Design an enzyme around this catalytic site. Structure first.
Site, PDB file in Angstrom:
ATOM      1  N   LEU A  58       1.684   0.585 -23.993  1.00 32.89           N
ATOM      2  CA  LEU A  58       1.641   0.192 -25.399  1.00 32.89           C
ATOM      3  C   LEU A  58       1.481   1.417 -26.292  1.00 32.89           C
ATOM      4  CD1 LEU A  58      -0.355  -3.108 -24.922  1.00 32.89           C
ATOM      5  CD2 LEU A  58       2.121  -2.781 -25.372  1.00 32.89           C
ATOM      6  N   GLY A  59       1.069   2.546 -25.724  1.00 29.74           N
ATOM      7  CA  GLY A  59       0.997   3.773 -26.503  1.00 29.74           C
ATOM      8  C   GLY A  59      -0.016   4.755 -25.987  1.00 29.74           C
ATOM      9  N   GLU A  60      -0.012   5.948 -26.577  1.00 25.90           N
ATOM     10  CA  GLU A  60      -1.055   6.939 -26.374  1.00 25.90           C
ATOM     11  C   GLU A  60      -1.950   6.916 -27.598  1.00 25.90           C
ATOM     12  N   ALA A 103      -5.735   9.228 -28.968  1.00 29.01           N
ATOM     13  CA  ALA A 103      -6.282  10.592 -28.855  1.00 29.01           C
ATOM     14  C   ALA A 103      -6.067  11.097 -27.413  1.00 29.01           C
ATOM     15  CB  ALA A 103      -7.755  10.643 -29.266  1.00 29.01           C
ATOM     16  N   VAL A 125      -2.483   3.346 -23.175  1.00 27.79           N
ATOM     17  CA  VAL A 125      -2.922   1.991 -23.288  1.00 27.79           C
ATOM     18  C   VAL A 125      -1.802   1.224 -22.621  1.00 27.79           C
ATOM     19  CG1 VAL A 125      -3.228   0.054 -24.832  1.00 27.79           C
ATOM     20  CG2 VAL A 125      -4.263   2.265 -25.360  1.00 27.79           C
ATOM     21  N   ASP A 159     -11.981   6.953 -38.165  1.00 29.95           N
ATOM     22  CA  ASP A 159     -10.546   7.200 -38.181  1.00 29.95           C
ATOM     23  C   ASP A 159      -9.742   5.959 -38.502  1.00 29.95           C
ATOM     24  OD1 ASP A 159      -8.341   9.067 -37.949  1.00 29.95           O
ATOM     25  OD2 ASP A 159      -8.160   8.665 -35.805  1.00 29.95           O
TER      26      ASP A 159
HETATM   27  N1  A3Q Z   1      -6.560   0.778 -28.164  1.00 27.27           N
HETATM   28  C1  A3Q Z   1      -6.203  -0.300 -28.151  1.00 27.27           C
HETATM   29  C2  A3Q Z   1      -5.726  -1.614 -28.086  1.00 27.27           C
HETATM   30  C3  A3Q Z   1      -6.498  -2.668 -27.925  1.00 27.27           C
HETATM   31  N2  A3Q Z   1      -5.739  -3.757 -27.949  1.00 27.27           N
HETATM   32  C4  A3Q Z   1      -4.489  -3.398 -28.131  1.00 27.27           C
HETATM   33  N3  A3Q Z   1      -3.406  -4.138 -28.229  1.00 27.27           N
HETATM   34  C5  A3Q Z   1      -2.217  -3.588 -28.436  1.00 27.27           C
HETATM   35  C6  A3Q Z   1      -2.103  -2.213 -28.538  1.00 27.27           C
HETATM   36  C7  A3Q Z   1      -3.212  -1.417 -28.421  1.00 27.27           C
HETATM   37  C8  A3Q Z   1      -2.999   0.005 -28.624  1.00 27.27           C
HETATM   38  C9  A3Q Z   1      -1.939   0.672 -28.041  1.00 27.27           C
HETATM   39  C10 A3Q Z   1      -1.730   2.040 -28.251  1.00 27.27           C
HETATM   40  C11 A3Q Z   1      -2.563   2.713 -29.139  1.00 27.27           C
HETATM   41  C12 A3Q Z   1      -3.608   2.042 -29.736  1.00 27.27           C
HETATM   42  O1  A3Q Z   1      -4.435   2.673 -30.585  1.00 27.27           O
HETATM   43  C13 A3Q Z   1      -3.827   0.689 -29.510  1.00 27.27           C
HETATM   44  C14 A3Q Z   1      -4.434  -2.023 -28.232  1.00 27.27           C
END
Ligand code: A3Q
Length: 258
Positions: free
Chosen positions: A13-15, A17, A21, A118
């Site tokens: 779902l992403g990076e 810091a 995830v 942040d």
């Molecule tokens: N961290 C986190 C997350 C907690 N639940 C989420 N659901 C979807 C995406 C994320 C998420 C994904 C990448 C970076 C980010 O900042 C948050 C999260």
């Protein structure tokens, strides 16, 4: 297809810091959560404190040798950043509703003595009903304990969102810093653009704001009611800046919209 106990780690779902995830779907129950894959001691500790509908819930963690796994509520609606159209923003009634929810989350945090440090649209996630949740507690810290406030002294955050005292003062209060960043988020929602690279007197757009040049962008895109609120939030002196109790009394904040 890696896994941790019953969960398959299905997609990134992403990076943040640090740390990826992942979306974790349980093979048995089909429950979907988000898992952060990675100082951490403190983060987990703050995460277990969190119990509010506009804050991302912590479900528990598992250390497996090298990597720690933090299980958290999934927000499958993406982020507020995805709802902001560049140079436009979003409809004022959507902005208002998100701002209401952001203030509810920040009040909650400040009430348990936690500062996020942040707040920005990437950290403001949406659930499948577009409810806002404040996420990512890797920079969060305790600013009030046993009813005694401590000032902060570490500089952190993201320059466009940080309050000016954080660049000028040795030590500063936590709460007005989080308020300021909510103000920058509200600007972004209503104008689709950030007002300055950073709030220093060496930054022309910031100087312009302090001289009240609201005939310029982004301010010229914003209606006079929300703009009057922004005049109270983006105040350079942190002790003159509006507090959240007073934001809740603001005319635009209480205006019926849509
Ligand atoms: N961290 C986190 C997350 C907690 N639940 C989420 N659901 C979807 C995406 C994320 C998420 C994904 C990448 C970076 C980010 O900042 C948050 C999260």
């Amino acid at each position: 297809v890696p896994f941790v106990e019953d969960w398959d780690l299905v997609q990134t779902l992403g990076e943040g810091a640090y740390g990826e995830v992942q979306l974790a779907v349980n093979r048995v129950t089909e429950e979907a959560v988000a898992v952060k894959i990675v100082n951490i001691k403190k983060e987990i500790c703050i995460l277990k404190m969190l119990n509010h509908e506009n804050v991302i819930k912590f479900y528990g963690h598992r250390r497996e040798g090298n990597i720690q796994y933090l299980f958290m509520e999934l927000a499958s609606g993406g982020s507020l950043f995805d709802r902001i159209e560049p140079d436009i923003g979003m409809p004022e009634p959507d902005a208002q509703r998100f701002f209401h929810q952001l203030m509810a989350g920040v009040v909650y945090l400040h009430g348990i003595g936690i500062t996020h440090r942040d707040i920005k649209p990437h950290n403001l996630l949406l659930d499948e009903r577009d409810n806002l949740k404040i996420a990512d507690y890797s920079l969060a810290t305790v600013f009030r304990y046993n009813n005694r406030e401590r000032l902060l002294n570490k500089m952190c955050g993201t320059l466009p969102y940080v309050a000016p005292e954080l660049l000028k003062r040795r030590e500063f209060h936590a709460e007005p810093v989080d308020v300021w960043s909510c103000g920058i988020v509200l600007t972004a929602m209503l104008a689709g653009e950030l007002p300055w690279d950073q709030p220093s007197d060496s930054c022309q757009e910031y100087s312009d704001w302090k001289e009240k040049k609201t005939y310029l962008n982004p301010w010229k895109k914003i209606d006079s009611a929300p703009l009057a609120l922004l005049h109270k939030i983006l105040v350079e002196n942190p002790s003159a800046r509006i507090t959240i109790p007073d934001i809740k009394k603001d005319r635009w904040y209480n205006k019926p919209l849509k």
